[PDB]
Amino acid sequence: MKIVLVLYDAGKHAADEEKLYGCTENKLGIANWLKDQGHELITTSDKEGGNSVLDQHIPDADIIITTPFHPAYITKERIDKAKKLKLVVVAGVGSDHIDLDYINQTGKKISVLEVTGSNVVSVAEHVLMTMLVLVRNFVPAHEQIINHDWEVAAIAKDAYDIEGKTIATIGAGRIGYRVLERLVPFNPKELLYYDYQALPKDAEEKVGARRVENIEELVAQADIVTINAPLHAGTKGLINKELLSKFKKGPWLVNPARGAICVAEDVAAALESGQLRGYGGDVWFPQPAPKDHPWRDMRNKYGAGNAMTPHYSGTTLDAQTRYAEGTKNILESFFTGKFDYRPQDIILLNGEYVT
């Protein structure tokens, strides 16, 4: 019962706010419980390089706990050297940093669990926020006031209502369906989706959505496109110069899924030429973004159309409380030997997929 968990260092910000659970200083709010229970807890942010605290303790550890906002990469190299490992937890949602194929093909006896559901509302709200900010031209308008200007015609000339627009999502899982739900009362012209599997007929009708089976047919009729899909072959590098030339002229694109689904230099060129009128979201490749990444400085012809943020949509204080509670629930199912996990939380039960 040795436990290693890696989180980022929040510095002075950790003392300002006690509900900032997912950091090295505050330890997901479970440190006192683990110590009372007789377990040993190593907490560190030092995860890169062969001389790292993480590597120093992995040959020993029984449990490793990770976060997608500072991921420890659980490589086969590290997996072979981890002789006592029985359980990997994601305090959040997202497991691209773990070699699930290796574990499953080798048949190792390692369970892998995440707190599924805990991030979906927060991301969906961030999509709605970014669409309104781009379509209504908010960023240059707030800039005028901070800078002590006032010139309405310069803002109004590229501002629209979202009412009456056609809106499409690439991906209709938990996050994309919740985006569609929140858009219904804004009176769009139509809602559309593309996905490798159909939504059930009852779910389609609740939001008035129509399935489009061809990706190029989908984007060619949309004023607004949002990406809510996983990263694999056939989605990696999907948003390139060729597909971008099928978009309507002057629409808006939002991506809070994975940065590598886009070709970074190609969307920047589309924004400068006017093929796109704006781009926004919070995911990058590489991540964290280098200081010279092209998405930092790109603009449209009027000097706006950029609504990027760092990667934080799933880390609001309401979301942090949910996976503090979810991590302790998972750990206790293990400690007790009940193994009464929530079915939706299991992504690998002793190196095996379920159902």
């Binding site: 194929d101 490798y196 599997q197 996983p230 990263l231 694999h232 072959a233 990696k236």
Partner: protein, 143 residues
């Protein structure tokens, strides 16, 4: 990179087996896919009504398209040094991707085995050994 420059110069200046393999894969690529598809569906009659992930006329044509993708990707690998472009473009999350589509992964492996047999049969004994290693790299990721 110096190691990459070296593998390119070898194609230009040294051995000609990579050139011969590429000549065959481009020159009869349509015959390789048509002949291998016939053999695949005889060994895996799951062009049948039930599951049949490839049941339609339309879904059968999508299957043969994917076979064309892997043949063009293996051709690129032969021309270049190595298998790195094969891994990063054709194998990324391929097991989870096909699983979400309903298509059985071990049947995709069998399709690449069938393309290996037809293509290799048109080559010299030595060229067929060299080409065969590239097909095997794909088969191993799906079986």
């Amino acid at each position: 990179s110096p190691g990459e420059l070296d593998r390119i110069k070898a194609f230009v200046t040294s051995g000609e087996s990579r050139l011969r393999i590429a000549e065959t894969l481009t020159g009869s690529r349509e015959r390789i896919i048509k002949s291998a598809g016939d053999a695949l569906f005889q060994k895996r009659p799951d062009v049948v009504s039930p599951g049949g992930n490839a049941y339609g006329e339309e879904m059968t044509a999508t299957c043969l398209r994917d076979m064309d993708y892997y043949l063009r990707l293996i051709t690129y690998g032969v021309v270049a040094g190595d298998v790195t472009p094969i891994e990063e473009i054709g194998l990324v999350g391929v097991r989870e991707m096909y699983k979400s589509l309903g298509t059985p992964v071990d049947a995709v492996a069998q399709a690449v085995r069938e393309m290996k047999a037809v293509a290799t049969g048109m080559m010299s004994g030595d060229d067929a050994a060299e080409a065969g290693a590239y097909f095997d790299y794909v088969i191993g990721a799906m079986e």
